[PDB]
Amino acid sequence: VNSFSGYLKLTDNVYIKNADIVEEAKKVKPTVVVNAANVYLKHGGGVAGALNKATNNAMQVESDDYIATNGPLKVGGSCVLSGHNLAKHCLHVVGPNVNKGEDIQLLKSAYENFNQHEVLLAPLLSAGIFGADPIHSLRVCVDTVRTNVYLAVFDKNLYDKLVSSFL
Ligand SMILES: Nc1ncnc2ccccc12
């Protein structure tokens, strides 16, 4: 048994809810929250900007030190950093950004990072301002992630379309 409430059961391991991820993280304090990161860990907008603002910019300060030491992530890659006031850990995962021309086949590689964690609170990778089709992102998630994932979708209209269209 875990602390997540009102998530709609999709599969054996994937759950979905129309919710503000900042607000969900603040309430649950999950072991892992996933950030929709870019390779530079520059959290200006989307899930990344929303999460970083909720940490009072401590996520960005930590991220800048990580990049200064290690250099940029790979598209499809990840790193584990602090969850600050939101979670124990933040898994920063880089899905491909269609609005930068990145290979959408890297979306499966991105979701494979989730399998290193038994339970996660996450957004749909490559959805929203990343330019991918969120229906596609949900299909890759279900077909890739084997660990228990609680998906928070910010937009109500998109949530309803994702549930209604789910195969
Ligand atoms: N949860 C969010 N709060 C504010 N802005 C956002 C932008 C994209 C996704 C989620 C959020």
Short mmCIF file of N, CA, C and O in Angstrom, two decimals, residues 41-44 48-64 84-86:
data_model
loop_
_atom_site.label_atom_id
_atom_site.label_comp_id
_atom_site.label_asym_id
_atom_site.label_seq_id
_atom_site.Cartn_x
_atom_site.Cartn_y
_atom_site.Cartn_z
N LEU A 41 20.05 20.99 -17.51
CA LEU A 41 19.32 21.17 -16.23
C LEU A 41 19.02 22.67 -16.01
O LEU A 41 19.11 23.13 -14.86
N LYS A 42 18.58 23.32 -17.06
CA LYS A 42 18.09 24.71 -16.97
C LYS A 42 16.57 24.67 -16.81
O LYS A 42 15.87 24.38 -17.79
N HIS A 43 16.12 24.84 -15.59
CA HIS A 43 14.69 24.70 -15.25
C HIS A 43 13.96 26.04 -15.41
O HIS A 43 13.58 26.62 -14.40
N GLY A 44 13.72 26.45 -16.66
CA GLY A 44 13.03 27.74 -16.91
C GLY A 44 11.52 27.63 -17.03
O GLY A 44 10.84 28.55 -16.57
N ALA A 48 9.74 21.33 -15.19
CA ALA A 48 11.05 21.76 -14.63
C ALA A 48 10.94 23.15 -13.98
O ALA A 48 11.37 23.30 -12.83
N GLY A 49 10.42 24.14 -14.70
CA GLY A 49 10.26 25.49 -14.10
C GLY A 49 9.29 25.48 -12.93
O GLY A 49 9.54 26.19 -11.94
N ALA A 50 8.23 24.67 -13.01
CA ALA A 50 7.21 24.63 -11.92
C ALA A 50 7.80 24.01 -10.65
O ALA A 50 7.58 24.53 -9.55
N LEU A 51 8.56 22.93 -10.82
CA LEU A 51 9.24 22.24 -9.69
C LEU A 51 10.31 23.14 -9.09
O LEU A 51 10.39 23.27 -7.85
N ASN A 52 11.11 23.75 -9.95
CA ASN A 52 12.22 24.56 -9.42
C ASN A 52 11.68 25.75 -8.63
O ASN A 52 12.20 26.06 -7.54
N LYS A 53 10.64 26.41 -9.13
CA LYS A 53 10.02 27.54 -8.41
C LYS A 53 9.57 27.06 -7.02
O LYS A 53 9.73 27.80 -6.01
N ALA A 54 8.97 25.90 -6.93
CA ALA A 54 8.47 25.37 -5.64
C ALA A 54 9.60 25.13 -4.66
O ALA A 54 9.34 25.14 -3.44
N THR A 55 10.83 24.89 -5.12
CA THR A 55 12.03 24.73 -4.27
C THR A 55 12.70 26.07 -4.00
O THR A 55 13.80 26.07 -3.40
N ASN A 56 12.12 27.19 -4.39
CA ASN A 56 12.71 28.52 -4.14
C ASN A 56 14.06 28.59 -4.84
O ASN A 56 15.00 29.28 -4.33
N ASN A 57 14.22 27.94 -6.00
CA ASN A 57 15.43 27.95 -6.85
C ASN A 57 16.55 27.04 -6.28
O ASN A 57 17.62 27.01 -6.90
N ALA A 58 16.32 26.31 -5.20
CA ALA A 58 17.38 25.43 -4.69
C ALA A 58 17.66 24.30 -5.70
O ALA A 58 18.83 23.88 -5.84
N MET A 59 16.64 23.82 -6.39
CA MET A 59 16.88 22.82 -7.47
C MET A 59 17.85 23.35 -8.52
O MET A 59 18.79 22.63 -8.94
N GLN A 60 17.68 24.59 -8.96
CA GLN A 60 18.59 25.18 -9.99
C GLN A 60 20.00 25.35 -9.44
O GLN A 60 20.95 25.04 -10.17
N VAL A 61 20.14 25.78 -8.19
CA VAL A 61 21.49 25.94 -7.60
C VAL A 61 22.20 24.59 -7.58
O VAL A 61 23.37 24.48 -8.01
N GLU A 62 21.52 23.55 -7.12
CA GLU A 62 22.11 22.21 -7.07
C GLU A 62 22.45 21.75 -8.47
O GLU A 62 23.50 21.10 -8.71
N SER A 63 21.55 22.00 -9.41
CA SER A 63 21.74 21.55 -10.80
C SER A 63 22.94 22.22 -11.45
O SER A 63 23.69 21.59 -12.20
N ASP A 64 23.12 23.49 -11.19
CA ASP A 64 24.27 24.21 -11.76
C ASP A 64 25.60 23.62 -11.28
O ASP A 64 26.53 23.50 -12.08
N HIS A 84 14.63 18.08 -2.52
CA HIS A 84 14.38 19.32 -1.77
C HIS A 84 13.13 19.14 -0.88
O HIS A 84 13.03 18.13 -0.17
N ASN A 85 12.22 20.10 -0.93
CA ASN A 85 10.99 20.10 -0.13
C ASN A 85 9.89 19.32 -0.83
O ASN A 85 8.75 19.29 -0.30
N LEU A 86 10.15 18.69 -1.97
CA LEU A 86 9.09 18.01 -2.74
C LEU A 86 9.10 16.51 -2.59
O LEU A 86 8.02 15.89 -2.81
#
